[PDB]
Structure formats: structure tokens, C-alpha cells
Design a protein around this ligand. Structure first.
Ligand code: A1A2E
Length: 17
């Protein structure tokens, strides 16, 4: 679920913020 875009500064689940 969470913990993937922390590595991009995007945090979590969105279809591109
Ligand atoms: N929590 C969370 C979470 C969970 C899934 C996510 C998925 C789909 N999953 C499907 C399963 O395999 C890994 C991808 C895509 C994206 C995502 C895709 C592209 C970008 C664009 C714009 C920003 C950038 O650098 N790229 C930003 C965010 N963010 C997600 C965030």
C-alpha cells in the first residue's frame, strides 16, 4: 500500500500528484 514514493518525494498512492 504505502511506502513507495518516499523514494521519490511522492509519499503514497496517487495517480501522479
Ligand atoms: N503507496 C503507494 C503507491 C502504490 C502504487 C503506486 C503506483 C502503482 N503501482 C502498481 C504496482 O507496482 C508499483 C506501482 C503508481 C504510482 C505513481 C506512478 C507514477 C508517478 C509519476 C509522477 C511522479 C513520478 O516520479 N512518476 C507517481 C506515482 N504511485 C503509487 C503509489
Amino acid at each position: 500500500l504505502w511506502q513507495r514514493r518516499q523514494r521519490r518525494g511522492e509519499e503514497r498512492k496517487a495517480p501522479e500528484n
